[PDB]
From Swiss-Prot:
Record note on quaternary structure: The complex is comprised of an extracytoplasmic solute-binding protein and a heteromeric permease formed by two transmembrane proteins.
Name recorded for this polypeptide: Solute-binding protein Dde_0634
InterPro entries the UniProt entry points to: DctP_fam, TRAP_DctP_sf
Subcellular location: Periplasm
Binding site for (indol-3-yl)acetate: 69, 142, 180-183, 205
The organism's taxonomic lineage, starting at the top: Bacteria, Pseudomonadati, Thermodesulfobacteriota, Desulfovibrionia, Desulfovibrionales
Amino acid sequence: PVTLNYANFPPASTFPCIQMEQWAHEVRTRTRGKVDVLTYPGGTLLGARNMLRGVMSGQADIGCISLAYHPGVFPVMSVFELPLGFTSAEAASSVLWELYSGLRPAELERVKVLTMFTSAPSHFMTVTPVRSLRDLQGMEIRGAGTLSAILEKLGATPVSMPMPEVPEAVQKGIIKGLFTSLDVMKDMNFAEMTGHVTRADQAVYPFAVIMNREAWERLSPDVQQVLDGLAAEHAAWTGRYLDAHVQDSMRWAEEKHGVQVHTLPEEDIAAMRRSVQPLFDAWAQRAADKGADPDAVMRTVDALKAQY
Ligand SMILES: O=C(O)C(=O)Cc1c[nH]c2ccccc12
């Protein structure tokens, strides 16, 4: 029997940790006890920033990274931080894993990628109501990576930070809100901090579950095929869990904490779409600057969405 240490950064209650536990359960079951997983939620082994380097140095065997936390590092897979039209985490997660699987971009060659998944679409959670784009102007809102770039295009003031730092930043007035999926209203108790939600139907945050190359290579071919054979099913499972849980989270937030929900006017939604359009070109240019083929990437994103 081998035991793999799986690091994660956010609290045990949140979806990246929930999925980690489910994955560990399946690994134990499907390897008939040959592989065990010892999990470290809440950043006790590796945190959000040192996750990638700590898995690569072998301080942990496995880890969970939010790609948006690593600017410049993932020129190809960062396409999934653009608004690609997904309305559910289940579809986005499945297409993300298929894109990685089909392109295997060099940016991730130095780790083994065990599976991938995404958050649900991003919305605004704020301390004061946002009923129009006018209300967002100059407002300090948390994002990361290209999600922060989206905020800047919309006229907000992005402040980038990893999820575990967000509650204090809101509590202490460093930011006025955050831009991400609504599961955190419950799972991190933002319902008691940000009493206003504005629909945005925006981009998702992509994640990878990564494994130290040497740890992976120390696994037998039969155990490898088991972990590989879990990857696609688990991507979908994670998105599916999250989709349902987002609805539960908002129900609890509205009913038990009086959260107010707002929608933007149609004209603001159209203007919002136009203002973020140039980020696609900027993504493509960075990708090409790094030797990748963004036309091919977008052709594959389009095909995989159509297949779905
Ligand atoms: O990766 C991020 O920081 C996100 O905003 C995506 C996300 C949505 N819900 C979460 C719960 C815990 C950690 C990250 C996220």
